[PDB]
Amino acid sequence: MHTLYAPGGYDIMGYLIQIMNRPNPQVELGPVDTSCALILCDLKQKDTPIVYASEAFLYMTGYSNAEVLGRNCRFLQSPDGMVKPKSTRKYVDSNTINTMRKAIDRNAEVQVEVVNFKKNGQRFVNFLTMIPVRDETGEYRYSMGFQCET
């Protein structure tokens, strides 16, 4: 992967405001800000890479900024952070992973519980929410994920 990052960063705050103000929410999130564990992935770049991760996300997973950026979030699904696309995970529910995948392909809001692993190998249940986000052009370009341990 050779993910590129938007020079000048991302309008995280503008996207959080966009999400809280969306007209027909399929999932209720309640108020949110940059304090939770969250990430933004680029839907238009190869294998939907992470182009931003809040500090709470790094704190929750144990990985640093350098270790997460430019990677598809699926690496958390393995205690060794090694998960090849299309692979049959041995520690994660296949239907769960397929649900996330179809929701993303369709720009449809989804919410699931997925088994994840921290950098030190510690297993936990991630209560994950993904919401598609429109950029300045008005079309879906990114996806915002909200991660919660338990």
Ligand X SMILES: Cc1cc2nc3c(=O)[nH]c(=O)nc-3n(C[C@H](O)[C@H](O)[C@H](O)COP(=O)(O)OP(=O)(O)OC[C@H]3O[C@@H](n4cnc5c(N)ncnc54)[C@H](O)[C@@H]3O)c2cc1C
Annotated binding site: 72-74, 77, 86-87, 89, 98, 101, 116, 126, 147
Q: State which of residues 104, 127, 134, 141 lies at the interface with ligand X (CB under 6 A).
A: 104
Q: Which token pair is 96?
A: 């769960």
If one asks whether residue 132 binds ligand X (CB under 6 A), the answer comes out as no
If one asks whether residue 144 binds ligand X (CB under 6 A), the answer comes out as yes
If one asks whether residue 33 binds its own copies (CB under 8 A), the answer comes out as yes
Q: If DSSP codes are grouped into helix, strand and coil, which group holds residue 141?
A: strand
If one asks whether residue 13 binds its own copies (CB under 8 A), the answer comes out as yes
Closer Cβ to ligand X, 70 or 74, answer by number: 74
Size of the site for ligand X (CB under 6 A): 29
- Is the backbone of residue 81 left (phi > 0), alpha (psi -120 to 50) or beta? left
Angle (nearest 5°) at CA 131 between 128 and 132: 145
CB burial readout 9-35, b (16+ within 10 A) else e: ebbbeebbeebeeeeeeeeebeebeee
Q: Which does 33 bind (CB under 5 to 8 A by kind): its own copies, ligand X, none?
A: its own copies
| CA gap 86, 70 in Å, rounded | 18
If one asks whether residue 12 binds its own copies (CB under 8 A), the answer comes out as yes
Closer Cβ to its own copies, 34 or 122, answer by number: 34
Binding mask 49-68 for its own copies (x = CB under 8 A): ---x----------------
DSSP string spanning 84-119? -TT---SSS-HHHHHHHHHHHHTT--EEEEEEEE-T
Task: List interacting residues with ligand X (CB under 6 A).
Answer: 39, 41, 48, 72-74, 76-77, 85-89, 94-95, 97-98, 100-101, 104, 114, 116, 126, 128, 130, 143-145, 147
